[PDB]
Amino acid sequence: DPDKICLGHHAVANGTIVKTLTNEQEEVTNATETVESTSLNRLCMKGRNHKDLGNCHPIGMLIGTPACDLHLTGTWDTLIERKNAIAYCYPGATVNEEALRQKIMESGGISKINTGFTYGSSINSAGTTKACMRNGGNSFYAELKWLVSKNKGQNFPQTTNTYRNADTAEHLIMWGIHHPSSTQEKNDLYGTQSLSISVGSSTYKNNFVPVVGARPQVNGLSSRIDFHWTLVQPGDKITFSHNGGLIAPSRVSKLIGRGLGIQSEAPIDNSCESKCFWRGGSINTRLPFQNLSPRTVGQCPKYVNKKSLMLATGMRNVPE
Amino acid sequence: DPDKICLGHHAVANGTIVKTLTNEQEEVTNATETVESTSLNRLCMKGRNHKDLGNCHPIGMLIGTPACDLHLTGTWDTLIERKNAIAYCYPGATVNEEALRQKIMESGGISKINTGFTYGSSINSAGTTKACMRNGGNSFYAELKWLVSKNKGQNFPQTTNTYRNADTAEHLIMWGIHHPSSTQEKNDLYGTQSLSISVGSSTYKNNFVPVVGARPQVNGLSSRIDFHWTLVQPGDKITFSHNGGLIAPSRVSKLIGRGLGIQSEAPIDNSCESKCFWRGGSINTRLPFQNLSPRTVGQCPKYVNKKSLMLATGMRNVPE
Amino acid sequence: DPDKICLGHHAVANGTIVKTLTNEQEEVTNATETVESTSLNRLCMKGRNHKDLGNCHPIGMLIGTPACDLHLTGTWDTLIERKNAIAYCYPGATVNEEALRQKIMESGGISKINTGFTYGSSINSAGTTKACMRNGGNSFYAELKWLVSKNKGQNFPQTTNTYRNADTAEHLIMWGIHHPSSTQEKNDLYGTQSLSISVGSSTYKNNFVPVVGARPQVNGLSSRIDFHWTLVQPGDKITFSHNGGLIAPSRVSKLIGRGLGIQSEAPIDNSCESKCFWRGGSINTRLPFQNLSPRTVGQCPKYVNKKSLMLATGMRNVPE
Amino acid sequence: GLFGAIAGFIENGWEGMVDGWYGFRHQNAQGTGQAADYKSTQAAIDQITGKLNRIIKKTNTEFESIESEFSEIDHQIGNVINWTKDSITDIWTYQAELLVAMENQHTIDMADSEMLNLYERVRKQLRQNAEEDGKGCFEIYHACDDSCMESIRNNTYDHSQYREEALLNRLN
Amino acid sequence: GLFGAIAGFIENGWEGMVDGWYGFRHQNAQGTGQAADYKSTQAAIDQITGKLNRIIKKTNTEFESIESEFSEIDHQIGNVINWTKDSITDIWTYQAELLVAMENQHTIDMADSEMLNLYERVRKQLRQNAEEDGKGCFEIYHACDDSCMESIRNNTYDHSQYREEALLNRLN
Amino acid sequence: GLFGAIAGFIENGWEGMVDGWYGFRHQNAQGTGQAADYKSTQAAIDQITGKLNRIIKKTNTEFESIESEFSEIDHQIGNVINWTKDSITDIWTYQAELLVAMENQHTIDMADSEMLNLYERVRKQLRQNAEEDGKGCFEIYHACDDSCMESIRNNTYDHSQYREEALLNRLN
Ligand SMILES: CC(=O)N[C@@H]1[C@@H](O)[C@H](O[C@@H]2O[C@H](CO[C@]3(C(=O)O)C[C@H](O)[C@@H](NC(C)=O)[C@H]([C@H](O)[C@H](O)CO)O3)[C@H](O)[C@H](O)[C@H]2O)[C@@H](CO)O[C@H]1O
Ligand SMILES: CC(=O)N[C@H]1[C@H]([C@H](O)[C@H](O)CO)O[C@@](OC[C@H]2O[C@@H](O)[C@H](O)[C@@H](O)[C@H]2O)(C(=O)O)C[C@@H]1O
């Protein structure tokens, strides 16, 4: 009998379920994901002046391990370390190792400056090894010299070598201590005298006594070349007091600017761009969260313990 | 005059006060607590393969202090350290002590593997002390041997003992250095000549010179047995070079899986179950917060600086 | 034609823009800032028993550098370290330096107790230097003595000095090792004879061998004097074995209670009060946030990455 | 409140009403009588139930101890931990003070709504056969027995069935 | 809902209505016909658009790695990091579970409102020339052609222009 | 808004109204006149006051410094602290952007409600003696002097006292 005008809202038959403060099963018209569950298997170095190290380890770059020969210097914005990366041709490890890598990884580039260090000819600074092969012949860390006495058994001469920071930004000086397998080896290179190696700067003081005695064999060698390091401040000197058994720098390293360090196993792609990376590769989502890995680097969605958080982008769906 | 129908809401006489975005004194029908203020005086090890150490300290387990004799090996899911727990019958402390405990408490169990180490009979590896009593007789750390010379005053023979990791997961090798009260004690066991102890692995290098000279008395003794440690990697050797004064391992320890470490003073209860623990015992509340202690362990309500947060479970209460 | 009554809301012509869940340009009647963007150029030490150190560095207080002379002891609730603050008149550096200052800055005061140490008159404990000037004349660290032989060239007598903690709370004993520039200096005070300095307590053991040989020149003096330290427990002794070249404490330091440490470059003001401080000075806002610096100390608004968060304190503004 | 129903145009609540949250009170020829409305009373409960389900929950994140209750940990690392924790503890204190406060505001106003929702449902049933007295009652302009009343509460009442009788009593 | 419009006094939604969110259905002399209301449908979208923009965002904070994926980090520091992280990750899990849950509740009820807001806008246009049927329609008590209907949807309909005709049909 | 009162069916607000937030404007035989409603204007303020009490607050947490502003701290531990901090700073940035944004939405809509709450209170007073014009006014269908108007604003106005006079003017 009477004319009518009706008010109403749209709907669909296949509507999405979301969670609210009250309902955990609330059905709505349209919704969207906020947690990214999908990764890229690749690193995305588009618009990035990046450097992939391959089997070169960041440390190796400053000391010049055979592998890192291509990575002694350069400028970039992204450093990419890899698994089992080689930093030590000759057995040993860097004291305060982790700290160094992290400093190198956050660095944007490497300059090298020469120490200039020269030694009297009672000393053999050309000292090479089988452990660090180069052109199918014995060689050493490019940025270090192996100092041994010229005449086998002769006591190593007391020397003093001192580097001055000529540049106006701080340099990173690296050196090594040699530990002999047995006193036979010790005396054959540095002599019977007990050795003491003193390093000094305005901000650094340290004494190193090489230790003799066998370890297990690694590449035919039970002897170790451990390395230490420090920053030398601009317009400052670092002095090397040694009786022998000091692996001396031929080169100080200078870390240029800053860059993003990605520890990954994934291949590069320069077609692809990103600001977020993890072991398993790149993450590009405009989304605000992700459940891939709590180990991310760069500008990244926050890791959450939720598979899915569905955000309603539409009204309650009430079906016919 | 005209019939009428009224609509309304319920109430009560004893209503609770809660806080909203606007009102700090808002009265409502029913409410509930969200902050748990009450604890259990006990640890709740129902459905837990737990090990209470009593006065055994975790470190003691790896070296075999008298107390820890019952806890030399085993598998569990929950480790329970206690106050003043004894790790050192004979005076001394472990170098890098805290790190070790934390590693043991994170661990779910302990395997022991034998070093196999044997010594020529110029050496006395049965060397016991009053400090570590066992069956009303002098004894020593079960997992270590006291190496002294057989003839009082005779110089201790140069020995080399080397452990190989047979297993496919890393082992934890522990040893001790002995520091003599005076040179009389030093020479009576190891001789007059100065002693040097070198330990070596693929990942470890270290030299130890025992130091003579009196400390204060502790259990009638001013002499010290400090311990050191390292992880020995699978298919690897650790070599012990010593002139004497080395307390050598008879046993390497291996930490099995992972487990929950509770530092508590509360007694056990196997009737009671929980996922949360602190000094003062268990916390079982379904509640999402707690103000008991910011030092909790396991799946736990978040510590907050609120005595009470009352959550409204009902409408505005208005009485007549 | 019929009389009418209207309902309506207030408004203004200059209304503020805020952000809501839906609108990022929502105009409202009144609003307020929640992020404080303005700082005080000054430190606000009203109602604070504070000590400004000026060019005294906290460490210097315990050894007694010329600068720190006014700050050898005292009690406070607020310590204020400054830039380039002087801790060592005579060239050198403290081993474990940073740890010490943090412990001093955490502390709310300093007591000094006398060691009592006396020496046979073959020894000169009045040893002064040009590096530490006082009353226009050569002097030394007030809390230390320079021990040299009385007769120039004579070998320094074997001495044993031992401090006992009389007090019932732990004391902080500091000392120094002096390294002669060359053997000429070495022999003029102690002679050619090799020197060895042993320090011992119930919880501390350490041996220090002075090293001869020239370093970079600092204030006309190539020789460097380094310091070490340890806590001595109540009712305990610390024993000093030395052949010479030990800079001995005349005074142990004791840290009283706890206090707030401000690293600032700003001047003091005792008219002004605050609970929050940073490099650039005080922060007083009732406000709940701030964008000044993420390095704050005390009870502080939380650092945020927003210039401004405008909180609506009124309704939608709709103008005529 | 937001909806003005509860602690609003409804003077107050009914201590007498112990069989629900939201209800009716008719007075007619027969006389007075009270009865609760389950369908609305339930909706409000069901919603708070759901809140409690969401809110009364801790994580299943196993946290290992980084502070020794017996041993003393390094002062540099320990200072970091103390700060890291106190900053976490400060967040959770806040994140909670907000959760409860917000859920409290919503709980209240949600109830407030489920009342107005009833009043409006009923008003629209009674159509032109009744008038709003401004205190959350409808003065019915026709004879309404315990049969007719239970027909309102049951949402079965038909306006047309009393419409003429009512409209006449109204214009008078 | 809160506003009772959606999943409330409106029995259900209109799968047919694919040209908007909120709309009309008249039946009259000329015959039936559907049409969506843009101005309201847009307001709800514009609001969700705004929700999404703010919600679908990460920070501009460049994070260095503090965990070596290849090297093994010290057990003391590593345990601290694991705890620091797991506690951060536990917050963001919560800060999100709540953000989405709350924003979902608001989105729903916001829509709910923009419906009631239409009903009320229209009710106030139709003044005394129609009556609420309680299912979200107005029985119009006068002749209303496709001209008159489009005048309601266009918010141009004038009650006075049909007022007498309607008021008479109503009192009968 | 949510309630449609403010920036909704009310065209706009009253720059003239400086004695409150919510108020009335009558025109009658006597002529025009404005006056604010305290009880509602206060309720909205009292609620924002309470918000400010909650929001304008820092903790009572004493923070010792874990970063030396002059000295350089170990690079491994320092990098951890930088991350720990930047993660905390990222939370509080977010936790705040949300607090303000949500409280802003609620502040607005809370005001929106306290308006509609007034309109509805008044509509229910005027009963059948007036009609909604759709712009937030009531055309009163009887003679209403500054006595009668102040009786509405005072919530004392009695419909029965003008009911017949009004009902007749209405049907005409
Ligand atoms: C010093 C020397 O020439 N020794 C001869 C040995 O090379 C060799 O026996 C084998 O020696 C291996 C170690 O040889 C090097 C190496 O690491 O490659 C040779 C290096 O050139 C030498 N250093 C320098 C500066 O030239 C280097 C070094 O001095 C280190 O002490 C090594 O730790 O040693 C390795 O031990 C083999 O397993 C071993 O059998 C034989 C040649 O038949 O004669 C040695 O005199
Ligand atoms: C306690 C003491 O021996 N003080 C000496 C001081 C130290 O021995 C020295 O600084 C080494 O640590 O030497 C003082 O003179 C050093 C001074 O000798 C001059 O002849 C020379 O011209 C100067 O460059 C400088 O080497 C000193 O004041 O430092 C004297 C002091 O009594």
Ligand SMILES: CC(=O)N[C@H]1[C@H]([C@H](O)[C@H](O)CO)O[C@@](O)(C(=O)O)C[C@@H]1O
């Ligand atoms: C192996 C050995 O030397 N054992 C003896 C020790 C050590 O000489 C001192 O403890 C030096 O630290 O001293 C004892 O008197 C003791 O503690 O009972 C006897 C013990 O058998």
Ligand SMILES: *[C@@H]1O[C@H](CO)[C@@H](O)[C@H](O)[C@H]1NC(C)=O
């Ligand atoms: C109030 O609510 C609590 C928690 O929801 C419930 O368990 C309890 O039975 C109620 N108690 C009273 C006295 O109302």
Ligand SMILES: *[C@@H]1O[C@H](CO)[C@@H](O)[C@H](O)[C@H]1NC(C)=O
């Ligand atoms: C952390 O707080 C506890 C409370 O007793 C205190 O004892 C401890 O030393 C604090 N640590 C630091 C390093 O400030």
Ligand SMILES: *[C@@H]1O[C@H](CO)[C@@H](O)[C@H](O)[C@H]1NC(C)=O
């Ligand atoms: C933390 O931020 C500051 C910015 O000056 C940087 O210089 C500092 O070193 C950072 N910490 C580390 C270890 O990178």
